[PDB]
Write a protein that binds this ligand. Structure first.
Ligand SMILES: CC(C)(COP(=O)(O)OP(=O)(O)OC[C@H]1O[C@@H](n2cnc3c(N)ncnc32)[C@H](O)[C@@H]1OP(=O)(O)O)[C@@H](O)C(=O)NCCC(=O)NCCS
Length: 216
């Protein structure tokens, strides 16, 4: 139920009843800086974006770090299988024209390219959809501890693989030191929509989305 990872930080599982405080934290410290969100307009995520993240909570695969009764970091993960490339591609279509559509446009291209259940001959993968740390607590292994917690949850659940799309260079550096394997790089300047326009325009130093996997 509770994993002390410092003297004052506790890692807890998110319950289906406590999602508002998780979304408040994400809206403050995940979405404004996450490169796909920051690289598309308007700045704030669409309802369908926020609702998709929260739809992972029933899986028991979402975790927060608590300091003095408050969320200071969070990770949102959920399962996927070999249907995910077809599903994401049709979801990207459904929302084409808006912000969530643009985000899905990129993420679907990456999912199709990586296709990790077919790639590594595994029946399923635990995919990390969001990772955020309060800026005042960054550099203190909170991202790492949350990722390790997802990996252990993945092990209990029988998953043989964890995947994550590091849209941020800081997340790429984190999972590199956790020993993840880089399997795909897509530079944002290389990803166009059908009209030939760059879909995602995030601030430097975020130049690419780098997808990593960890074998469990
Ligand atoms: C990605 C993220 C969770 C990593 O934070 P973290 O786990 O605390 O990062 P690390 O422990 O690996 O810190 C390594 C160094 O990089 C810095 N660092 C981490 N994130 C940073 C960020 N957005 N911006 C600038 N520096 C950052 C740390 O302060 C630390 O530097 P220091 O040792 O001199 O103090 C965090 O950057 C974040 O929440 N970003 C906003 C949301 C986002 O982009 N999520 C993408 C998920 S793919």
């Amino acid at each position: 139920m509770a994993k002390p990872i410092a003297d004052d930080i506790v890692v807890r599982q998110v319950d289906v009843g406590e999602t508002e405080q998780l979304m408040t934290f994400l809206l403050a410290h995940y979405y404004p800086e996450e490169p796909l969100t920051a690289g598309t307009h308007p700045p704030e995520p669409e309802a369908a974006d926020k609702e998709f993240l929260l739809s992972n909570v029933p899986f028991g695969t979402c975790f927060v770090a608590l300091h003095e009764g408050r969320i200071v970091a969070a990770v949102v993960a959920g399962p996927k299988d070999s249907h995910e490339p077809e599903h994401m591609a049709e979801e990207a279509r459904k929302y084409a024209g808006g912000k969530w559509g643009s985000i899905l446009h990129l993420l679907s291209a990456v999912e199709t390219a990586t296709d990790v259940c077919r790639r590594f001959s595994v029946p399923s993968c635990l995919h990390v959809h969001a990772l955020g740390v309060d800026p005042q607590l960054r550099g203190r292994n909170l991202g790492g501890r949350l990722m390790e917690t997802v990996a252990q949850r993945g092990r209990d659940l029988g998953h043989q693989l964890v995947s994550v799309d590091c849209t941020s260079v800081y997340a790429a550096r984190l999972v590199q030191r956790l020993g993840y394997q880089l399997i795909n790089t897509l530079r944002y300047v290389d990803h166009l929509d059908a009209s030939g326009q760059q879909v995602i325009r995030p601030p430097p130093p975020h130049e690419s989305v780098q997808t990593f996997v960890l074998h469990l």
